[PDB]
Design a protein around this ligand. Sequence first.
Ligand SMILES: CCCCOc1cc(C[C@@H]2CNC(=O)N2)ccc1OC
Ligand SMILES: CCCCOc1cc(C[C@@H]2CNC(=O)N2)ccc1OC
Ligand SMILES: [Co+2]
Ligand SMILES: [Mg+2]
Ligand SMILES: [Mg+2]
Ligand SMILES: [Zn+2]
Ligand SMILES: [Zn+2]
Lengths: 334, 335
Amino acid sequence: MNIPRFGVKTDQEELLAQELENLNKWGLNIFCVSDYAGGRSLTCIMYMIFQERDLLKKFRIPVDTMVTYMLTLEDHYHADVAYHNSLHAADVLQSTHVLLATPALDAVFTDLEILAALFAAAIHDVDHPGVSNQFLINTNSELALMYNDESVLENHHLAVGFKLLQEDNCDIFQNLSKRQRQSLRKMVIDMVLATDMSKHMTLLADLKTMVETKKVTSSGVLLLDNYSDRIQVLRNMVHCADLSNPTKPLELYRQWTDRIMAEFFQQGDRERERGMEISPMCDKHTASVEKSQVGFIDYIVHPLWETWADLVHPDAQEILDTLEDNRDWYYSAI
Amino acid sequence: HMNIPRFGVKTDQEELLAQELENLNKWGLNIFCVSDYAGGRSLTCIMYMIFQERDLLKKFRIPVDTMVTYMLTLEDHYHADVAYHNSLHAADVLQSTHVLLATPALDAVFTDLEILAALFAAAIHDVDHPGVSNQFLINTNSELALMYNDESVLENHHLAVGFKLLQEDNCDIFQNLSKRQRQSLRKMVIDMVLATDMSKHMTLLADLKTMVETKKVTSSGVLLLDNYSDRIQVLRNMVHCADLSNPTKPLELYRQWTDRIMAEFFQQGDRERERGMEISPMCDKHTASVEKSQVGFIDYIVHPLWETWADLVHPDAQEILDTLEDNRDWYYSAI
Ligand SMILES: CCCCOc1cc(C[C@@H]2CNC(=O)N2)ccc1OC
Ligand SMILES: CCCCOc1cc(C[C@@H]2CNC(=O)N2)ccc1OC
Ligand SMILES: [Co+2]
Ligand SMILES: [Mg+2]
Ligand SMILES: [Mg+2]
Ligand SMILES: [Zn+2]
Ligand SMILES: [Zn+2]
């Protein structure tokens, strides 16, 4: 198979090259990347992130195996889901890539831990059906039964992500040792399960406790002594990345908002057709797009990022300012 | 439990939908219009209307709310981003089957249970289709090809999904069938859905042809099928004909069907090319003749199938055959 310059075929290589200049920045526009990559934002961004961090050489991952797996992974996100499609995966992965580079975390994580974080981020919503856990529980679906109603989707994303390693020429981890594969798998499971919003309040309270007794070295770089603390930081980092839409430039944030509301509204419509209770914010006749975002920021997103900014102080100050400006925009657009 | 709309589904174009639905029992029904006027819920709409039309809810004691919940659940398991094998195709095949069941030469031949089975089989026959052929699933070593030992991989999956969905909340439309009836329906549905696997076409058609050559007709010119073997044979071919009915519909619909199957094929080809796989037949957008392919499809598969069907039901399908021949000419003179 052909391995194109940026991992995917493109009719607009120069415009794509120009956006990829921003690979390592919060200000990257993944929507442009997606347009210029013919819809393959996940395969493109993951290829580039992997080349950037030299991960193929570091783990002896054959390049065609990497691309085969990434295409397979991307193909198992549904294009007909308005928000939880591969563009969201790509965005969360890219955001995780930037967050990994934060100065307060310099030289803290091993390449294996980094590998785990990025893989977790890429697979974290694979095969999302565009309806919430509660919808699967209320319909008595096979998936809710399979996972005892507990983190139904997050369990499924993990099973699908690892299972796809078994399709032809897809085992990107073939050259990791046993201990390496086991440690990565354990870390990935931990990170993806922590993306379940029902764990959000628990996650935030523990992040706070950890921040209270944080240790900094000479130059304000974090000291993470033990596994427990390292995976705590990584699970919260992927969570922050998942909830990073309101921290991005308003132009991008507004596109993410339209997408989530389209997805929620379609769920609400399906609920109404089936005689089910309509889930929170899923009723198009009564929901306010702008008020929902304000409440979302005030009670979920800002308290999370404020605690994160505390952890990595002063590295995330800008994100917090942006977050405050965006709250104000939605508050005024009411 | 829920308030059942007049035509089974919510609509802001109720009168336009009512007009199209007058053609429910006809080959000339335009399902694309039904879809537009039923907010994209073609499968739920048409299936509801057919079940009322044949009084199947009362005959099998199927609660309406249960029927509707199942139908919406089934239709939602067809993918919208798949150009051809979406719920519109299922709606189409179901409605065609419904018309083929009513064909004068088959009058009083099938029980209500056999009719229920045929319609259920048609409605579920492609559910959860990923938009790629069996060979793509086999070549990629997918979980499904492994489960089913590379044999009718998709068709087995359609069956598994269609049946499993009965177990979702308030979805068991067969709750009031007896145990014998359930077993018999299950078996018939399996045979019909598996017969939609194109690698079976040759044997289905050879079997149908043999039946035509020794067919028995009653007093009125109505077909005589004494035994089950013959009946499931005709049902299998009927659902296969319906699945292969696009070239037999008015040209305007047939052309839309062709546009859709090529978009789906080219997408598969694009994915094969990305993966460095050998590109499946007619899936290369760079080197394909849409018109020749349609001509080949009719010449080698569709016309021998429909000619043999028309011979079985003679003369009820004469018009279907004429349209087919005219549509073939069009794609031929459009080469
Ligand atoms: C309904 C509006 C209030 C919430 O908005 C959003 C909510 C999410 C959370 C989704 C749901 N569960 C998740 O794991 N992620 C993401 C982006 C949003 O807006 C841009
Ligand atoms: C590639 C063009 C030649 C074939 O065209 C068609 C082929 C099908 C058959 C599909 C493929 N497998 C099936 O089980 N059903 C249906 C409609 C078509 O066109 C209108
Ligand atoms: Co899809
Ligand atoms: Mg998720
Ligand atoms: Mg099929
Ligand atoms: Zn997510
Ligand atoms: Zn079909």
